[PDB]
Amino acid sequence: TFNRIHLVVLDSVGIGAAPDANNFSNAGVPDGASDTLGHISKTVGLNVPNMAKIGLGNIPRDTPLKTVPAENHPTGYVTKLEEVSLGKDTMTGHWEIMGLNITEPFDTFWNGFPEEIISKIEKFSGRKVIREANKPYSGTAVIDDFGPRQMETGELIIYTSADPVLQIAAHEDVIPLDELYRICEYARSITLERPALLGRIIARPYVGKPRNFTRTANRHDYALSPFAPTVLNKLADAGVSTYAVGKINDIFNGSGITNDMGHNKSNSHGVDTLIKTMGLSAFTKGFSFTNLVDFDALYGHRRNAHGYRDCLHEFDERLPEIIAAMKVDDLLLITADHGNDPTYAGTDHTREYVPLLAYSPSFTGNGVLPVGHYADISATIADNFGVDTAMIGESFLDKLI
Template identity: 45%
Template sequence: MKTKRIFLIVLDSFGIGNAPDAKEFGDEGSNTLESISTSKEFHVPSMDALGLLKIDGVQVKGKAENIKGSYGRMTEASRGKDTTIGHWEIGGIVSKKPLPVYPNGFPKDIMDEFERRTGRKAICNLPYSGTEVLKDYGKEQMETGALIVYTSADSVFQIAAHEEVVPLEELYKDCEIAREILKGEHGVGRVIARPFVGKDGAFVRTSNRHDFSLLPPKLTMLDVLMENGLETKGVGKISDIFAKKGISSSVSIKDNRDGMMKTLEIQKEDFTGLCFINLVDFDMKYGHRNDVDGYAKAITEFDTWLDKFLHNMNPDDVLMITADHGCDPGFPGTDHTRECVPLLITGEEIKKGISLGTRDTFADIGASVLDLFELEGDIDGESFIPLVS
């Protein structure tokens, strides 16, 4: 099989339930796909045609008869359910040790050093919803100039500030300071800038979010591709997640729609390598906000776009679609959920209608990407390409 370009799309948080260890994470019964399928806004004929609704364990009924891709589900081998761990595993790193989380806030010595080096007081320092923290602390932030520091069930150190009070350049610098402090035992997966605008009672987060990630602990498929002269294009927060390591070029996006349009532009380019795309709205705007209809509508919009993408594929292109974790908008709470994720693959030379069953790790994608380019690398995972070629 001769592959020139691979497009790997991560539908951020699009879980499909049934993770065997969900109970250990307090997520037993969560199922993002099933929750959004109850909405009148849910309509996914393109993904149905690729086999989404034929995946083992999926109870949502589909209408497609002639399946145009191969399909399966993947369980997460890493001890986590966050964006960083999920993407690293897709790239070929199984993280047996979970990244640190802070259900009671960050230690005093960490916060003292952060305040000393930034020159600003920090307020909150608790796990919080990103929208609720603005309701409770946004006014104080504007009045005092203090930085809102908060976390979640994930390994994150988030800093929120009003753009008119703390300029973006300063906020990003404050995040860099936090990233320098948070190492070793306190090496959180991501430090995230969360700028906002508006007035008390109507604060809104802007698209100027920026992630400062921990360096991956070992080589990923991205490093192997670059070492062999192939291009690695990141769309969305891919470059941030991998701390720019293994990324030859990156395109930032404002939202899902912008990401999909920019991916269509890249599809017109002549390159050899991987285009790795993250579409974050599913997670950020809908999963965390328990918005079932909004999530369903966003998936439907992606599915409509997917039909156009599929028609524009070249004979030597391969498309893979997956997710990095779940964030069931119909499940109690607003945190990520421990779920299996879908695996869809299609291309002119990819066999159609093959069930790939249940894969033991997301890292099988990384191994398969290398296999398609006939490369070898010291990464985790087992290629599924022999099953579909």
């Protein structure tokens, strides 16, 4: 029915604490007071007239978004969607958006990896791990802060980030690449189950000299693929094109992705890439899936409400460009994968409902859809292209056509 469907994930753009929010926490504080869009709106303001026109301010909430009025003549269909999976991480949310139910949520490690994991890597490698570096850390600061020490002692530098990732930095002159990879493979093999379930292990070789290090191209990644076919696989198996923009290919480890358009330098460069992709003469039928990550990486995790607002405003300003590039029989879906309330305690994601905005020039109606679940997105897409659903989700295609 829609010849193309373009799904855009505004990473972390939540619309209020989920019913099961208090099963999740932020530096010990349960997530049940979180509200990414509402707390932004109430503190720093929020001017998003293009999303409002589609209907962002018509999405049901107990208390309305302070600065996003209801729209009595909306141009699209909107609602909010509830996460079923037992995790609030990026991989879980995207996998569920594409139809999986994740009941073994990836572990994150705000206070570093536990002794069982470190002790094991030390015994396997014969190298000590620098304990002070075993915690969240920018890849760059960690190489600068502990590399000098590493060059002298041969110790491993094992660090993480807000994501379920284990990264091993090792200078090529003192830790041979082959050993780094063996160490990473061993690491990957002992992190397949909770409480050490990791999305990916990254080898981070690097060369150079103190106060001036370079991270080399000898990087290798050891990622988990989705454990069951997702709707991306269903589409690809049926010969339907699947175009990925931004973090999408990494998140799915390329599974069911026919055309990876690569990483975003920024949200704006991402929107440029989506627009270009929509304009390809080759792209006549199928699915595009874009992640715009800056909301999460730059603003949510850093608890910066002012910046989060500006990033939302900048996306809204560009939204008319995305729409101008649509064909009449295209569908645009805008959503998120969890919350990351910049006003909250902690520095993690927040367990929230996510907005759903739906727009096509072909629409003969508009309004508000019943509240749903993340994987309803996948099922709608499957329904549209005549392929099977994955684990979960129910189509709302008939409310759109």
